């Protein structure tokens, strides 16, 4: 009746204004079976990475123009502390294995209210490759204080600046212009998602089972699933009320395994 | 297999670890991956198994380049006590490898042969 | 009728639920994937080998290496360049300047389908020639694996090793056809039409899968090395889905507006 | 596991002998010496008798 | 019948001459219930952190004097990477927590042979306080490599030198004569203990249950098992033999708990 | 007869095991810890108070503060200085000198038979005077507590705030004895004989427990400030432990060979 609370380990959070919880594909996203590629022990749940961890994304001002996005790669932001998060035990264990797999859980929150105007689109992109700059390296925290928010324009619509596979001096470049991991804006809202306006709630939450094209994917690289959020109406306010206001949001693992123990990581 | 004097005695490391930026380089890392302990006595063999750790089913058999599908890691072998003799023996002994496929090992998928070896 | 779109989950309606009406009858079901994809269509256009061959080096290449291009052809919807697979399609549009041409290929009709992110399918093969009168035969050699590159020396008449080998190879009378299906041999469970991993540990480039194709596909005269032409010659292939099936929605290309 | 490899027989195991784990599954047999050498090749090459 | 192999998790230990297992107080030290002073979820074990972990000791020479003994203190082994002791996932839950408690399996290895003679004295010694300096503070992992073994005086005999707290000036300093963590070398054997010598065997393997106070204890400080190994009888061997034998051990945690999750330790 | 010493485990055997003969009757059982323990031995020597106290500082006391010293004693048969929990035992070999000397005591054949760890009991408390004919009474207050130091005025009379509270208070006649006994009331389960952890988190010093004791014990003259006399009085304390249990083994003290 639009009041609930979520519990899990030693966390809870609430909500004055709930519209409900999408389940992506099947009637219980968290049930799951062991993988069979490795015959290994694996590692099953623990009571002390049962829980939600916060964080918090850049602030959502006027002067942001139509379709513009900010991404979070789920299994990459542990490992780069994006926004502040941080894991503890679960990033402890997940440098220290070569196998992982795991459903997730989140929830976005917004502070607006019945004088302010706007609209955020909410969905989890699977597959996708927002977070690498074009030269093919991932975004240093440098860059995100600087592009505030990922424009939008025809390259990123037509995937013709992917990460690039250097063609040598033998051959002559050609000329590129169209890739795989386009992204096409005015069909977003086929991926599991909600949509977030001034008028009826703030906050949205989306269930998520696993997938991959393996039964388990290297803990060091998979990318699985994304996080996105994008404009849809830009803000508008009277004046004198409440400017910029603020995002954060909340994940967790559901179901994880792991397998292949070793020391901890260290690139090379 | 040990094929040192029968009076000596020594005890040996060994460990299997997964693919990782770089490769062990001491004990205190090789002690955290997989590993066991075998020591010399009576009986002069020991058998070790490699796990099938792998992010999919079915491994490529070379490795034109070192994608996870190709290489699975390492493996390594630690002296973990220098070994005992008693006065006149010869010193430096000597140990014995021999492999093999396992009970569920299986293949796949024939392709031709290389004919180089008549050269 | 009123409904809040904002749950994400909306019930599709009909005529009577809000006038006076009926539904219609079902009709036809030719959206069936399965049915859809059943059909064959042209993939790339190749040479044909009158010697023993070099397989083209990896991507860092410089200049001076010495090599065959333009002769292998890979069987994968994604996009491949220089018969090795690739991110980005290539077009030249503006064919002058010294450097070799890169070959490029693309699925059209796929792409333009490719609703999904997952895929997997067995594949039918079927080449056609594009000279008058032409007599040749076609290999094939499965996914993760190289192509043997020597010859032999019979009655002083060298032979090129790719003849002879335990994994298919056929030949065509005057003017005929070749056909044949395969099975899915990748080691991937399934084809990722869209990809964000990294294949190596480090090093790597993202979103490029490392096996994601059926095998490889060549064609050659049946002659020794001793009756090299001075003309070259050219094949056709066409592919062909079989029994496909999908498994998680995506997003259609972005048509431009003019 | 302790053994001698000395007696040439030898029991081949398994990874759940000394740690946690399973078996496989057996997978395909394409290893049948049946099935392996059915595959045409070339042999040799001759010429061709236009007289006795 | 003198060979035996123990395994756990992903590890397995052999030997070719074992005398038994000693088990400590009870039929079966393993068996134990969760803690009741307190009332949050606790944390069990789980299948990354069952293994046997191994370190090194400094080298037994013959220029050793009689009752030299050397010292490991079993938790704080691992929080002071002490002999090259890594705990790696154990060591990681356990600077994630307040309170915790567990049993404990050791065993020890050494390498003589029938040409040598010699005895060495391998007991677990509760309540102890040998690692740390009569200045009151714990030793440094240089101390170590000077003070190769420890030495045997009155001032250990007695306990004249235990941990210090300063009186001020405004009262006249006493004699200090003695105190309550004395150790007497002649009763060592009263503990749970084996006696390894060159003749018979070369491990020694001692099982024991938790023992403390109150039914848990601070993680960063509890010390309330010790591991200790003493010289009996002096080595000697002909000339020409084997020099400086080497020693090492290796410790097993069992039915572990945990409780009050926090952030990553740090001191102040 | 043949065995092996080195697995720790020896079977106690008796004579005819060996050789001809027969097992000795059981006796008595004088040597059960319940029994053995209850007997009252002295602890400590005392002085008696005579106005409003102030209780000595903690131990990093520079000179020149004003308190009283040697009012108080603690119940524990561990090691104590100054009224407050030590580590190590202390002895006075040559009184001269500036500087205030520092009470000490110790429980000798506790310490004696101290052969465990850990150790439980009740304990029952009693005190004699050792001046002819005097009046005093004892005051008591339980473990992690503190000492209430004021006085209250009564017709110009000032009267010490320890005369009331609602934790015990006993009186004596001329010449006579004060008895009572105690609970275990500390909030660890057991008193450890020997410790090895710390209770503050950092800043702390090993081996010293933090309420290793029943409580502490004081005795007080009941007349009014406006009586300080001008000779000191001492009193003796007795202790005896009740109902004991002993639960791991340990080691004795050491006895030097002259």
């Known amino acids: 009746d639009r009041v609930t609370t979520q519990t899990a380990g030693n966390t809870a959070i609430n909500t004055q204004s709930s519209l409900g919880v999408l389940c992506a594909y099947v009637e219980d996203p968290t049930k799951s079976d062991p993988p069979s590629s490795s015959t290994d022990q694996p590692t099953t749940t623990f009571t002390a990475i049962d829980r939600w961890y916060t964080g918090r994304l850049n602030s959502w001002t006027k002067a942001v123009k139509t379709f513009s996005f900010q991404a979070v790669p789920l299994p990459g932001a542990f490992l780069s502390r994006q926004g502040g998060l941080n894991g503890g035990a679960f990033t402890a264990t997940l440098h220290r294995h070569f196998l992982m797999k795991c459903g997730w859980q989140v929830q976005v ?114 990318n699985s699933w994304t996080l996105l959020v994008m404009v849809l109406v830009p803000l508008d306010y009277k004046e004198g009320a409440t400017t910029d206001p603020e995002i954060t949001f909340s994940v967790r693992p559901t179901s994880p395994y792991f397998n292949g123990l070793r020391n901890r990581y260290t690139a090379g | 297999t040990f094929c040192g004097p029968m009076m000596a005695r020594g005890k040996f490391l060994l460990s299997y670890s997964p693919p990782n930026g770089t490769q062990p380089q001491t004990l205190s890392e090789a002690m955290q991956c997989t590993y066991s302990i075998w020591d010399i006595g009576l009986n002069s063999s020991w058998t070790f198994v490699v796990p099938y750790i792998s992010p999919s089913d079915y491994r490529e058999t070379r490795a034109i380049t070192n994608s996870v599908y190709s290489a699975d890691g390492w493996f390594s072998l630690h002296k973990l006590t220098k070994i005992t003799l008693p006065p006149d023996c010869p010193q430096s002994p000597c140990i014995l490898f021999f492999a093999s496929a396992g009970e569920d090992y299986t293949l796949r998928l024939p392709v031709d042969c290389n004919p180089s070896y008549v050269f | 009728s009123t409904d809040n779109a904002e749950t994400g989950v909306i019930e599709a309606g009909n005529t009577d639920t809000d006038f006076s009406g009926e539904l219609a009858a079902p009709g036809s079901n030719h959206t069936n994937v399965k049915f859809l994809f059943d059909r064959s269509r042209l993939l790339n256009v190749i040479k044909v080998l009158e010697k023993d061959a070099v397989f083209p080096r990896p991507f860092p290449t410089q200049e001076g290496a010495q090599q065959d291009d333009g002769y292998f052809c890979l069987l994968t919807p994604r996009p491949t360049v220089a018969s090795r697979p690739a991110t980005r399609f290539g077009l030249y549009a503006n064919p002058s300047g010294s450097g070799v041409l890169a070959n490029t290929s693309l699925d059209f009709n796929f792409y333009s389908l490719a609703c999904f992110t997952y895929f997997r399918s067995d594949l039918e093969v079927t080449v056609v020639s594009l000279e008058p009168d032409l007599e040749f035969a076609v290999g094939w050699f499965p996914s993760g694996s190289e192509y043997q590159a020597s010859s032999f020396v019979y009655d002083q008449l060298h032979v090129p090793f790719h003849f002879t080998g335990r994994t298919p190879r056929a030949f065509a009378s005057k003017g005929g056809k070749v056909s044949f299906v395969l099975p899915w041999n990748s080691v991937s469970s399934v084809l990722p039409v869209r990809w964000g991993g990294a294949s190596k540990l480090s090093s790597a480039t993202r979103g490029l899968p490392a096996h994601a194709d059926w095998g490889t596909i060549y064609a050659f005269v049946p002659r020794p090395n001793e009756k090299k032409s001075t003309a070259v010659k050219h094949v056709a292939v066409y592919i062909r889905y079989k029994n496909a099936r999908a498994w998680c929605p995506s997003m259609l290309p972005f048509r431009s507006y003019k």
Not at chain 1, 149 to 159: I, K
Not at chain 1, 165 to 171: F, I, K, N
Request: charged letters at 15%; glycine letters at 6%.
């Open chain 1, 109 to 222: 929150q917004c502070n607006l209210t019945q004088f302010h105007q706007g609209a955020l689109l909410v969905a989890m992109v699977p597959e996708t490759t927002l977070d690498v700059k074009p030269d093919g390296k991932a975004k240093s925290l440098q860059e995100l204080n600087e592009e505030q928010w990922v424009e939008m324009s025809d390259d990123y619509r037509t995937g013709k600046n992917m990460p690039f596979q250097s063609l040598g001096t033998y051959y002559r470049p050609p000329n590129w212009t169209w890739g795989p991991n386009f992204i096409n804006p005015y069909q977003v809202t086929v991926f599991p998602h909600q949509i977030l306006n001034a008028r009826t709630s703030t906050s949205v939450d989306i269930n998520v089972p696993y997938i991959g094209e393996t039964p388990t994917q290297s803990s060091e690289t998979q």
